[PDB]
Amino acid sequence: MRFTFPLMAIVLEIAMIVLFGLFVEYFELYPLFQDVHVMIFVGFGFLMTFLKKYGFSSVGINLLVAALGLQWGTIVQGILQSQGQKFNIGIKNMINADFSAATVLISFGAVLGKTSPTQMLIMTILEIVFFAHNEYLVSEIFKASDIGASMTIHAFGAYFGLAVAGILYRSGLRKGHENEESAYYSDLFAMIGTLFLWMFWPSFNSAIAEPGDKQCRAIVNTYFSLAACVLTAFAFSSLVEHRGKLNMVHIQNATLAGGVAVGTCADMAIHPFGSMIIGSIAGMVSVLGYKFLTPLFTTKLRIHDTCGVHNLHGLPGVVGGLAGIVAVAMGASNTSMAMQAAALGSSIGTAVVGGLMTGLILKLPLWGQPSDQNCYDDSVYWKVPKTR
Amino acid sequence: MRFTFPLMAIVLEIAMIVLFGLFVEYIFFELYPLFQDVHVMIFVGFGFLMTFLKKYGFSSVGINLLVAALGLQWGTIVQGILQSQGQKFNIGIKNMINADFSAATVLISFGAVLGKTSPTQMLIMTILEIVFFAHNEYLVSEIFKASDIGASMTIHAFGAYFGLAVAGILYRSGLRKGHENEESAYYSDLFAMIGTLFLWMFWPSFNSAIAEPGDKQCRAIVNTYFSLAACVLTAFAFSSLVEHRGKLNMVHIQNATLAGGVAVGTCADMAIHPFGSMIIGSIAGMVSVLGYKFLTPLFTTKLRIHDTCGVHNLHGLPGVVGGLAGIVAVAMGASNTSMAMQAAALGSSIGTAVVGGLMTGLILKLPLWGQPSDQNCYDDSVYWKVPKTR
Amino acid sequence: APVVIILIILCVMAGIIGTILLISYSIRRLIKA
Amino acid sequence: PLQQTGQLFGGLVRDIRRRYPYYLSDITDAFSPQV
Amino acid sequence: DAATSFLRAARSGNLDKALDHLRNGVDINTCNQNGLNGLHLASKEGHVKMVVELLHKEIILETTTKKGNTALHIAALAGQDEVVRELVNYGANVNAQSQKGFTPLYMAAQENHLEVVKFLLENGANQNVATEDGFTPLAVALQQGHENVVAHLINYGTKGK
Amino acid sequence: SSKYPRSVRRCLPLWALTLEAALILLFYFFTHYDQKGLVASYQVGQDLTVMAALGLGFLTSNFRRHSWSSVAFNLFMLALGVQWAILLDGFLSQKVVITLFSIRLATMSAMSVLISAGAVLGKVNLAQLVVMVLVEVTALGTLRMVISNIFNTDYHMNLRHFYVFAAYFGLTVAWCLPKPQRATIPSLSAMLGALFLWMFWPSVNSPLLRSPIQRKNAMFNTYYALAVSVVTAISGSSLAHPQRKISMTYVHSAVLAGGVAVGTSCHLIPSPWLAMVLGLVAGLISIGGAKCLPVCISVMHSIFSLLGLLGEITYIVLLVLHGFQVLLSIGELSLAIVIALTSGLLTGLLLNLKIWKAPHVAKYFDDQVFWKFPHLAVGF
Ligand SMILES: CC(C)CCC[C@@H](C)[C@H]1CC[C@H]2[C@@H]3CC=C4C[C@@H](O)CC[C@]4(C)[C@H]3CC[C@]12C
């Protein structure tokens, strides 16, 4: 039915309005919020525009998913911190809502080109529920330190998307697809999202950091981790390709893995050289993932990841959690070992289980899923101009 | 003829310098981030929003830049003169933000006549429309004392109806059935999405830059945030509803997603609760999509008013909706000031915009500014060196 | 308890969309034949 | 519309079959000031 | 050692050392670990005199490397105009295909070597020969933005040899 | 020789990984960490970073087939340059304490190289750009140290010479390279970069200013000068063009004319009208340079050089109002020029070495030299 998507959008918006009227009541962090806002809507949205015939869907469904996501994440994250009661809205609520949107967009990275906007609304709602519950668990029951959210955002979104894409596996797409290819100006546009994410990631890891030494440490550690990550990602992209050529997928994504793997240790006293070590390891791991693990996941494990969000968010997020555990080992933080490890395990497991359930729901032929031949094509859901 | 554009520009700039030396002298750093966001809106969001035309991207972004650069100076001069009653004044961050607001009004009017004007025509339109806008907004803020902190009426409705009047005066009979250059392209629409996203993200700074620090600024930011969030959902839903086979339209996603930010402006600082801002954003998106689908063809064909970017459906109709939402807010108690004064401000904005746009378009209808022919409309090559390769 | 809200809220959304689709979906089965 | 079919709930299903196809027109025909 | 020294001399253009090695008894058809003989290396480095001298001493002109590239393939990919001209003058097959289906015209077109493209077209290179991907020299020149090569390929059409 | 590019599978990764490991080791041995306006201070450096990455990366992407390399190589150059500038500013100004101000200053030092590289982008590979980054940061630090030792100024305050140093360094390096164009989507992406540079350039003109009123007046002067320069550049482009059309390429470089012209004196100009006059004069000089410099390689870097010289000259003129200091300031300018030229010559002769595997002169301004593309024959 062509009316399923407008119906679900209108019903979800009405539900959001009712929930806000039921639960919601009414400045130094606003620039950091705006940096996170730019990341969420430009960086992720245009980072995904590398596909030659899916740029409209990439950026537009990014905007739609994140716009629904900030409202639904606001509601869910408040009702948990309020324990079912009315809560007020400040800048921190907005920042956390954009964080929930980030998690959903990371999972959307795994299913880009093979899902409908209706499936995107459904996965937004369900994934935000699961993400907010796991994040509340980590932040309040385990009380682990995840200020940059290598575990609660990046690893969670990556493995949620991987579970969804595994459930939504198509046999006809395992050997590749004709539309699953980048263009020249498409990669030029994807560099916009890459650059904005790289520039504003220090605000991502320091927005809700405790003011004082912790926020400054988050900023400096993120900056130097990204600085080392760019060099290592360039070096390993040249290393893994024929004749030392650079791969635009690597430069677009693996250059940002340092901001993911430093998130747990962002506010910890890990020193700029330790942050640079983490960023270099993250860049190398991301490039190696793109070169070797993604074909093995697509062909053998039957998990297709369109944007390679495993190599950017999951493996660097797991590396960030392990780095948090090691930093706890050598006195860089006063948080417990077992709580960090439990946060990592709970994030990964909750992501996998929620992704399994959400993908099973998304597999019902009611959401206008595209055919195998029509994957990675804007014309299934958009009016496309005649010329590029 | 061949030198009208540089000569008019150098004369205008020398006039700006003389006026600045005659009238202008030298909280700032707390408002500077919001001014930076508004500046990004003015020079990137508006500039790239209009780059959807396949052969008019250069002229879109470049004339946007030129118009806004002249507009900040001229708006500073005119608004400071009006505020100081002809005395010398010192500029602060508020002067810069208000000058960018005047430039925004001129860019909104420019969106109506995109592709059918010359840079000289835009210089003249900027100069005249800043005077008209500043006088109307001075009347609204000081004589009516209405509350329009997000300027749904003084900026959006004013600029939209000013541009509509100018386009009606500058109507071309040969452009009624369309034009081969008046269509979008893939990467042009991606650049337009760049502009759309920057406007959408930084709109809370637009609506809260002038608002009084404390609860009013925070309410403006939160209300704009959630109104835009609801507006995106309703714009997507009604774009899917109104088009053939349920396909989404890039025009709707590019423009109607900012209708919630436009329509929440008057009620931005008022206490309407975040749910009330979500209702305004949800309706603003509905009305913008319906306007783009139905009212724009009727305006172009029946009313002989061609509006290129659909700035009516984004600024005029959502501006009148925000103006009326502010009237219902004072009636519901969410605001000081009278309902009669809000209604007077709305009516004055519309009427001054229409009258000034008629006068400005009559001035621009003279054959002295090198306006393009019917074939050369929506074509960069009239004024720019266009590369052979796309 | 707040977990039950997200569940009750999720249950209400799931019940609404499902029922609406079920009605139009059924009427399609009654109408096509 | 008043013929008996002999099938249980035949009148009801025929009523639905006759009217519900026009459901889309039942919303678009209302866009008039007379309504 | 002798074969390695001969191949090094062929790569460096030291024709005197290579002629000395051939005098001492080094086989002229010896190739490196990548399947490249002295003709391939000289064609890569643009050593026209070495190419002509090796062709005189009865090197196998249509010897392919481990990737299936002939000397003409390598000279077209390296953009050696004079080496391409001499190889064609000595009877190199201009329509040879490598393992992945590349022709000398394809390698000249993908690398924006307009002179090599023009000479190959004038010597009967068929631009309708596609690779295993279905790509033509025109298609790869369009993808890479080589506008002069695209224009020359379109204007030539099917004028033949 | 062989126009097909030589394999960099062993040169580029080893070079980059060795550089990164050396930076890590130096940071461990020499760097260390340690309020109310933390976010406000972070904002200036963040604006500098946005400009350096985005504006200077996309501004030089107007090339039909070198946009990838421009953007990504600018990102790589910034990432390397900030770290090396942190270490070298620590070494030549004293253990190294990493504050946000030090990161901001390192970002400025990296922006110097990013401005210089616009004269050589499209004619070099990544390793040559690494050499350029290292040598140029070293030369700028040496210049600042020499100025601080001779004229008894602060080392960090000597960074105001970076416009003219970057312009002449880029010109000198580009002059030493071997000797040898635009599309529409690449020109629009470049407008985006130029717009971000033009919008955030008031942050370039006041990162080193401590007094809040000085930053006030500097930002005001830069904003108004940049507005006047945009108007003058867009309108006067038609005069300085053979076909009497506006050139996007001229507009990209010339919009920054007012910001460059008042950069060294934005905090000394007392009234906005003087900043507007300077912006107008800078725009007119940009038009004249566009109309004249090609007659007498990159025209935009030549006009940037002349604009930086004009900015230093108007600093000289304005400082007298606010004759020995005139001689001292001309001496500082000449020393900066001489050091920029000499270090650019050294960098140019270093870049001409065969070991870097530079692209063939027929393969300039082409992404295929450095990047993977599908359906291409690879190897031999
Ligand atoms: C999140 C990832 C990394 C780990 C967990 C993923 C697991 C649970 C997922 C991903 C791969 C999935 C399988 C991939 C392919 C198919 C084929 C389909 O016809 C039936 C389901 C089946 C057999 C999936 C079952 C669930 C599965 C095993």
Ligand SMILES: CC(C)CCC[C@@H](C)[C@H]1CC[C@H]2[C@@H]3CC=C4C[C@@H](O)CC[C@]4(C)[C@H]3CC[C@]12C
């Ligand atoms: C990827 C998995 C295996 C995690 C291991 C990452 C390693 C390389 C990281 C994670 C934790 C890091 C350490 C955390 C804390 C310390 C103590 C501090 O005073 C200096 C930095 C130093 C010494 C760091 C060095 C690098 C480090 C050991």
